[PDB]
Symmetry: C5
Subunit: 203 residues, 5 copies
Amino acid sequence: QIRWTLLNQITGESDVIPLSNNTPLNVSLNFKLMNIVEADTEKDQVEVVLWTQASWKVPYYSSLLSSSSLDQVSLPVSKMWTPDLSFYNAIAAPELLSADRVVVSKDGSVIYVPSQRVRFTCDLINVDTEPGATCRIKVGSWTHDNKQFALITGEEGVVNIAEYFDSPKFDLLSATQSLNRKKYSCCENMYDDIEITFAFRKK
Amino acid sequence: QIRWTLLNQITGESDVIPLSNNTPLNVSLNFKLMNIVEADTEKDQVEVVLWTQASWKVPYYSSLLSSSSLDQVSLPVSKMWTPDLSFYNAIAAPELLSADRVVVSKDGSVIYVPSQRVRFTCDLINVDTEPGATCRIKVGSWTHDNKQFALITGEEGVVNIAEYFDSPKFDLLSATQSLNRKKYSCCENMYDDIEITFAFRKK
Amino acid sequence: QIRWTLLNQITGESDVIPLSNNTPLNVSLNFKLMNIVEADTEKDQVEVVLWTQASWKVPYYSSLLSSSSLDQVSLPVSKMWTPDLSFYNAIAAPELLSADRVVVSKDGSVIYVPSQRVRFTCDLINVDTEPGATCRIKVGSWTHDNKQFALITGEEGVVNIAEYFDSPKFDLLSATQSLNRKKYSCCENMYDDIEITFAFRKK
Amino acid sequence: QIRWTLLNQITGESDVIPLSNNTPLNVSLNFKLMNIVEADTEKDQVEVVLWTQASWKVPYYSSLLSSSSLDQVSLPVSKMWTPDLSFYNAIAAPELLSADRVVVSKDGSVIYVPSQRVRFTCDLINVDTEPGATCRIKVGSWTHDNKQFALITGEEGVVNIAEYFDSPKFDLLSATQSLNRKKYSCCENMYDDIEITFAFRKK
Amino acid sequence: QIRWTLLNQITGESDVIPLSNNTPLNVSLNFKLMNIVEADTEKDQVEVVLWTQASWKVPYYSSLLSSSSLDQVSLPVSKMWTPDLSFYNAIAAPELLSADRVVVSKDGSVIYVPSQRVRFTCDLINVDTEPGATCRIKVGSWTHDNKQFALITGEEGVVNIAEYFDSPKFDLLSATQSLNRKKYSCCENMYDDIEITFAFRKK
């Protein structure tokens, strides 16, 4: 149902980011904060459910469906390169809540939306006040610098991090994101990250 | 015991939904709500034990058995494509409680019945009243739109979710399911989901 | 030090229950309840440590040792078909506590003894009284109906479920087992199961 | 660096205990109790950190290095057979806290030292008194009987189980062991075990 | 996009530490203490988030990129030998929080930075006084002695373990790291270890 032999090159190359020429791969990231599921005021720790909507394009993947009546194909994440996103301020390993699959379209654009439960520390002293408590989540490639992996995000038009939030216990008061590019001790080059700031209080 | 060389095609193709023609694959789901194992009123979270009874048919699979004594065969889930059903409102990774195997019939129809412990948020303010609290569970394919993967109510109808329910702690008042479809941001086509709605109260 | 090439066939057929002709495979199950390690009266949930002693025979396995001074050989579970036993009433995935290995004898009989911590719902309202609380553990193949997989067990001799029980916190008052056979609403045929009934109380 | 094609035989045979003749492999086990990290008096459960020092010899492994400048080689456990030690009285799966690797010397000697966190039941009624609480840990092969796998242990004067013990919460009062050989029911031959007995009290 | 065939040799050799000559491999380590996420004074147990910055050089790896546009390449850890660093005094298995990948440079140096949550025991008697409680973490190779694996200390600073520290619950008062060498039972050769010592208190 697909060009199966191509898929063997694709998985064969999966250890390495798929670059064309020298150009950085643009990886588009958008976030949806879905729910806050722990707000532990004694430990000062929060758990959220977050959907990371990631997409990138590898033109040579377009041959996968060229001869197929499929418009797109869903494939296990293990079959190709996917971004090594890490939460820089996670204090427990994020827990995947969705199927570990990506969708490839006819033009080679790839879409990947892990839904994860993520824990981090946050000062919850004001969580039961009208302004609420303000928390941040930082996400970026752990190992691909910005010469190879460049973060892009939605337009000031389309960004709506709180769009689908729903909780019977907490009110989500605001949610914004910055796109950052920083030098660290390890490496020649800089790393891109997006950081979400949000505020919430108890209902 | 079976046509082993066919299994090599079946496993070989297991990354991709098995379609023929354009036609979406029909996947029927029925559910058994077995137990409500937590209802935490301070966090507004509920954990249930749920069997998902999923079936679909792949004509070419029928040759697996046609010349063997066996009327059906049970195989590990890793040997073929299986639906990537996710609980859209899950707040923890569902925990599999039963052996991960499917059963293939002589005509190539397949049955898969995972038992899973699933956690999600619910407003429990009324859990201790006669009408009780109403909770919803949303299930659908994470990455196959309804051009490829169509959900249908299975043979048992919408009416037998509570058949095996047993708890010393909770009364299950009612349970039904409804089939819906939604437009998502990522994609042009809609996704099918089945939504389970149940009411329960403390004993 | 065994007939390795025969292991190629054994492992090659490990997806499928090893039948000779049409006859169902006799799988014998005996149990030892070792301990009760949680009895939560607020949640009504018990955790036990249980050994399931399972044995079956596959005559063609006898060639594995025919050439060797080994009387029996221990092998990884993954190298052959083993029974897909499940706890029908588990509310958490069972935790294996022992080496995942089976032993094949020179006559091709196979012994598999998993030790597992298993959690289930039990009404514990009477756990701190003289008669104690009565709990049940249901065990059977998840996907092999009784036309393929026949459960058998010890007579009134060899059956002593409480033989090794030790707990500083609970008295095991009595444990019994009973073979049963049920048809399920999802499914055509009947499945064998053994139900273990036990009573315990606080020391 | 090493005779790589030898390792192909070593890994190839890794499913099965490496005997020569029909002599049991001698497996030497010594223990170091490092710490007691849980003593829950409400549940009468203890957790310890324990180093198990295992070693055995497989003369044919000597060719792995005989032409190498390496005096010994550290390898992943998955590359060769290792003893299937179980804690016969564990109530949770022991958690590995150290790298899963063995060291093979020039003579074919193998050393494997896992550090594990292990939970057991123990009557803690006297933990806060002078006699302390006395606990036992029993360890042996789960599936290799003493016709194949024979335990040996420290030349009874260099058995010092308490040697590196260190805790700010508990005094280890004593720790000894014995080497036992017992008959089991599935089992026509006997199984070796070492039982550690220790007494501790709250500081 | 790289020299794939060379990667076959690198992975083929991944079981074994990469030495040239009889020279010890220099493995450089620096640490960043990110957070203290638990200090349980009842149990005298501490959890921290720590980045371990490791680097080492393997000259023959330089041919991986020789003919490529990439100045460096990120690869999954499973593709090459990486150090078997263990927390000698961990009381629970360290939890990895970051993507499991390394970066290989044009000259064959390798960078690996695991973020981990690590638990250990610490006398917390003084955690709530001005000088605070002093804790220690010991890191080194579990199975590579210092004739094969030599520890050298990080490239930027030695008291700046705290560069990224942030906690709403605790003040970090001091942090230092120090190289040591310790002799063990198993081995006629010594193992290097780095000991982080830090003092912290409740805010």
